[PDB]
Write a protein that binds this ligand. Structure first.
Ligand SMILES: CC(C)(C)NC(=O)[C@@H]1CN(Cc2cccnc2)CCN1C[C@@H](O)C[C@@H](Cc1ccccc1)C(=O)N[C@H]1c2ccccc2C[C@H]1O
Lengths: 99, 99
């Protein structure tokens, strides 16, 4: 598929048995998901946005399905205002920017 | 070109006649550049992302070259951690996401 940039590039994802909407974000190094109760162990992390840092829980080896394509990797969970799919997972689905 | 996402998608820009490096950021609604002197009138604005808000100067109708492609549009200037090319200018240069 191709996604234009007139509007925020939102897609459906599946994570932890739930469907959500998420932003395809080439500027994000990491994937950040809104607060949800994912199972198992996690590690504390702080991550920086344009405005400063927030506290998140780092979960490793988490499977996400992104617009029908699987990715496995690290997912950060915390109080983000949007679900963000970052480069760590976008590479796995073969996503590119083109112009 | 076609840009993969294993590294940050950094490109060279020209703004106010000066070369800078900037991040292609599909998760950014707007374009924000680190503090610099820029010709034109501006108006105060606030933008928010992860971590909160920053105060910026909004410059309308600014000529900017992005990886050799011309755009003319709104450029925000302020204490962003990195120079960011957002959707307002990515649309101008014809950028799409593909997977
Ligand atoms: C891993 C994490 C998500 C924390 N990364 C970021 O936030 C990075 C931070 N770097 C910086 C950094 C910080 C620390 C270390 N390395 C890099 C700058 C680039 N952002 C990526 C942005 O695309 C993130 C989005 C998130 C968002 C989208 C919609 C609404 C709220 C939040 C973002 O901040 N977008 C905002 C945005 C951005 C620019 C201009 C205007 C606007 C408005 C809004 O679209």
């Amino acid at each position: 598929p191709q996604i234009t940039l007139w509007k925020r590039p939102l897609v459906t994802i599946k994570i932890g048995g739930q469907l959500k909407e998420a932003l395809i974000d080439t500027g994000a190094d990491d994937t950040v998901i809104e607060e949800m109760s994912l199972p198992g162990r996690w590690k504390p992390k702080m991550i920086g946005g344009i405005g400063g840092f927030i506290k998140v829980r780092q979960y490793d080896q988490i499977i996400i399905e992104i617009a029908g394509h699987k990715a496995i990797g690290t997912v950060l969970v915390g109080p983000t205002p949007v679900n963000i799919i970052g480069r760590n997972l976008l590479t796995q689905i073969g996503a590119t920017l083109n112009f």
